[PDB]
């Protein structure tokens, strides 16, 4: 069989039925005779292609397959790959290369030294040495993306390879299964369990790999047994815990001093599925104050190695959370009391406070809504004001790279047609991947986009305060008409200039059959 | 003095007065106290930032300075860097890094293994080992970008470096001059001149480094003296010769067979400032037929090494073109006859043929117009139908990466306020860097954008023919309203649905004070 | 024709007739049917292979061809490649790779991600995508190594490629010539010449690229015309000037302060063919004192960019030295006074002072001897005490990596059979590449090896003084019998335990027909 036929058979046998792409000449021999059991999702720029695929992979908890055009297409996607690396997203990024005989003369569209292009943002990067072994290289890519710690991989394929005969041993690839579903050996697990049972004032911190593993419910059980407060680790890309559960204590600020203050007094701190820690802002102080032992469970050796404190165990989050939840004793300590309800902020008949927007969303959205956040100055309020009961309910750019949420919201909605996706995106952030809107229109993917328009890069004004930076250019973005941008790409466009309009526009959007963009005038 | 103060002094002393950027926290300590003799040009996404800077650099024939945000911002610009590499654009790309103390824990916005990120698309990539040596690193970056063969470079700077004391010997950097303005030694130059003088039927092929060097007029003199036909090398990123000069024979098709047939019969072919050759489509045949000797003058050792045929000389294009033009004898052969005028294609009262669009542009645009091309199915007709008499009159994505022309047209217009820039961009290509429109509106940069809307990726339909590729998904882009997109970013939007409307809209756009977008309905 | 046949034809047509190698399975399809007009030089370890080839290339002023075994062979040679990079040695390093079909499974002897292995120590590194284009890749490698600035390159070739059919257009590669023989344009050259003519107290500093270009005689004329003192730039890999010419001022110490003190009072300093500057030890101070302008002529853009001071011109050293020597005016100033003769140090009838050894060598060696230095604590004395009148008379590890001189002395002797090579090597340094001795015995290459045995890493004891480092382990190397090592590899072994024995052993060695090693007992 041809490399083309064999490769699509491998993909379908490994569970893949969707190609996210932006096409070019080097990809036509791969895309031709596109099989009837596959679907192609076109996006108009490669940051959008990868963002959509990323959302889809994160929500589906399965690998997503991408096809880009040579160096220029790969290059346009590299900011998106930076986020995918930090979120451990299983992305198989393929890019078409020139014919083997043209690479050395560097014909137009040659991807020069291709394997090096996406580094250091991929787990594995490769250009096969022969056409016949392309299916083997694709198998390697699929498994490298899917094994813990999951992440993006890159495969560059010369376009003349697809019509060649595949290695006739390729069929052994089709049904290979690779497991990383491992947990600490019994002897050492029993020791850890005794340490948790012996703690007088334990605390738990959860990161995004909990939600990726769907270990949320096991973490709820563990927190209830230990009667322990639970925080989400800073710079959170996902939500690993029901945010109105009595044990929940919210998002940790991404500051060294802020976090060691929160942990003080807790004799054992158990961190599960997070780096230790994804700090951000300048906030100097102690990593960990005296009297606290930290134990980290992570799926990623790189995280375990770089932690500045604590013991670590490298294992599967799902398997470890399930084991701990079922082995620890039920403590007779008092169960924590829930955090108080957020205060209502007064809202006059003018521009909307972000607190008003989140309170209104929480009042009106379905209880299984999925939120994406790229409204960078309002994250703390978002976490306080949205009740997110279910797994898979929150996404935020895991490497801080803007241009994630708008396309990712489309991919999430494609993966989860039964759950309403609502992306809350600042006016600045919306531009990075604005053309992704077209894909929602074209494929009638009913994502709701809430644009928080205050005319400025607001979070950068906050950082300017922290960093004592005055006379800084480039912080204001006046003169963008988001309803016109939405019309440009075929998406229904509503406005909300006051609270009454916000309520009406959301009511309408939640009743719509296609995607809807709401431009909200928010306070500066 | 501080690293901040010393670095701005180095930049101004080296002739830099403009920063193209999209800001973030790691860049605030660089951008604060922004000096009064500098200007900042904001763009909304980093492919746009780099495209604008690239157009500015290419048109101004001087380095452009860029400031991006860590890995995510750098990553978003990597497709743009692929084009810049191929066009030898002197781009100084700086990116802010986390504090030195935070890199090791990989805080959010740490650019991990930063120097490797932009490779292989840069000449030089570096992260300084100490704050005090940041000015030295910047000096190295400036000169690496500016020396032949010019190209992009990358410097990653931890944000805590800017407030530190600079090396007190940094002042030696300020006025360093580095020259690569070199040409072949007299003995070997005389040998080359004799070979040209005795050729019976010479031909000349010119590439983009001729236009970069402003060697165009010297090449006209050389062609007139040798009485030689002149072609532009394939996949042309720039125009190196007056396109209605009698010697001019047009753009070479980017095909191996096509080019060897054109050169057949010419005993000596002199290639100046081009790779040998930037082939593209599948078009197998001989590189060079018997009876022809090829001599290449290139500024780039990499080009010289990879040519499949001919002798090469690595030298400055300006210096070599000037020397040759002034040393060769005047041949008594007949001057080549000018190419025939293109035929006027039949045009009814409906959608526009591209030939009609180019004929109308050529009739109406000023003689010193500057064109950019990202209308990928219409390039051959564009070259035939636009009379471009002056240097610096044409730009096309040098690596074939879409998303170049829209932002680059803004940078070119900023560099050349006295020359009307007209970007001819397909409906597909327009989306890659659509947000760049905002920069033209905000800074009132009066670029004209002509969107050729035929609803499809037309060039990919053509490639599908050559590659015999049927049932290919993703080739159509219906449902984009470009007038609404322009309104979204504050750019005046006109329509042209037929020839009368095209004439009217162009007359208006040529009389406008700000940027204008014209959406032209073209034939499928 | 086969890839094998075509590749050997390319090598011979490009002037290569010698393969330096250590063989393995992946190289047998290349080495089989070895052409009768080629010679193979075997060495027993790959650092030795590369060092021998390096000496041969440097002395012959032409590229040398190397064949190593996969990753392990390449890896064993990487210290040698570090020296080759710094000396701009034109080395074509080929390494055999596994068959294409086995690279992806990573069979034993697969060179994984091969092109990245030798980086950053090579100008170009590549693994061809198709067998048919291996001759093209070899052409690229030859020209990349040979173009200014010359340096090592790497090509990894799957072993199944050699028997495949070569691209039948490969014959266009055979006679390609690339010239980098360029110099500054007339206008700017005349400006430089006027600045040199107007200088009141010029100084000249010369580096290794002068000797590589055989520009030595032109630099002598330039110095005589300008009546200027001449230094050799620090950490000198080669000798660019007659060391007893009256202008010669010796080797610059490799310290920042030391060099600015030496240059004080000189209004113009012209540096030719050197980095500015290859400092070594800690010696902080001013790079250049006020009142001194520095102008650097270098063949290497990387050197020009990183200099912390001065103007620079990137051009061919041969072409520029010849041009300047012939254009400058004869100065009316007095010629510099020759340096005084070195003093004779007291020498008893016991162990030899190094000064005694060098004085004796200078008294006895032929005037056209070629010296190599890897006696690290005695370099200053060697430069003061050896009269080297001719080009090509001195080599020292250009990156400071020990293991160079012993093998390189064999390659230099192979390249220059009419000049006696004398390598002066410390007892510590001798061990790094000791097995190279076998190649001298086997091929009867009559190098003389003078081992300076003082039982210690003496230069490191000096650095420990500068760095105030006490209680350092590993500085002594007692108990090595060099006469036994020489016998081990079949090289005649003599001793010199006092001055009379040194005189006798040198007289004998200079009359020998094969290689000779002399173990000299030197003071500690
Ligand atoms: C690709 C990329 N470029 C720039 C930044 C820096 N970024 C940090 S937040 C921010 C402002 C975002 O503004 P907006 O989306 O309007 O939200 P606000 O801060 O106003 O709530 C910027 C530009 C980034 N993180 N990623
Ligand atoms: C970044 C990037 N992605 C994809 C491609 C492949 N590309 C080749 S031409 C083309 C179609 C462009 O369509 P349009 O601009 O409408 O012009 P037309 O071909 O219709 O004239 C595409 C998508 C590319 N070259 N660069
Ligand atoms: C590969 C390598 N390893 C270690 C060193 C460090 N090196 C600097 S000089 C020196 C001592 C060499 O001793 P010897 O050759 O006996 O000469 P001496 O210093 O005694 O004159 C050492 C080990 C080096 N330069 N290169
Ligand atoms: Ca067990
Ligand atoms: Ca905002
Ligand atoms: Ca189109
Ligand atoms: Ca000249
Ligand atoms: Ca010693
Ligand atoms: Mg409305
Ligand atoms: Mg990279
Ligand atoms: Mg000359
Ligand atoms: Mg390496
Ligand atoms: Mg003997
Ligand atoms: Mg003896």
UniProtKB/Swiss-Prot annotation, chains A, B, C:
Record's keyword terms, sorted: Aromatic hydrocarbons catabolism, Calcium, Decarboxylase, Lyase, Magnesium, Mandelate pathway, Metal-binding, Thiamine pyrophosphate
Known cofactor(s): Ca(2+); thiamine diphosphate; Mg(2+)
Domain of life: Bacteria
Molecular functions per Gene Ontology: acetolactate synthase activity; benzoylformate decarboxylase activity; flavin adenine dinucleotide binding; magnesium ion binding; thiamine pyrophosphate binding
TM helices/strands, residue ranges: none
Pathway field: Aromatic compound metabolism; (R)-mandelate degradation; benzoate from (R)-mandelate: step 3/4
EC category: lyase
EC nos: 4.1.1.7
Cofactor: record remark: Binds 1 Ca(2+) ion per subunit. Binds 1 thiamine pyrophosphate per subunit.
Reactions catalysed, as given in the entry: phenylglyoxylate + H(+) = benzaldehyde + CO2
Any Pfam family: TPP_enzyme_C
Record region (Thiamine pyrophosphate binding): 376-459
Gene Ontology biological process: mandelate catabolic process
Binding partners and assembly: Homotetramer.
Name the record gives this protein: Benzoylformate decarboxylase
Gene source species: Pseudomonas putida (Arthrobacter siderocapsulatus)
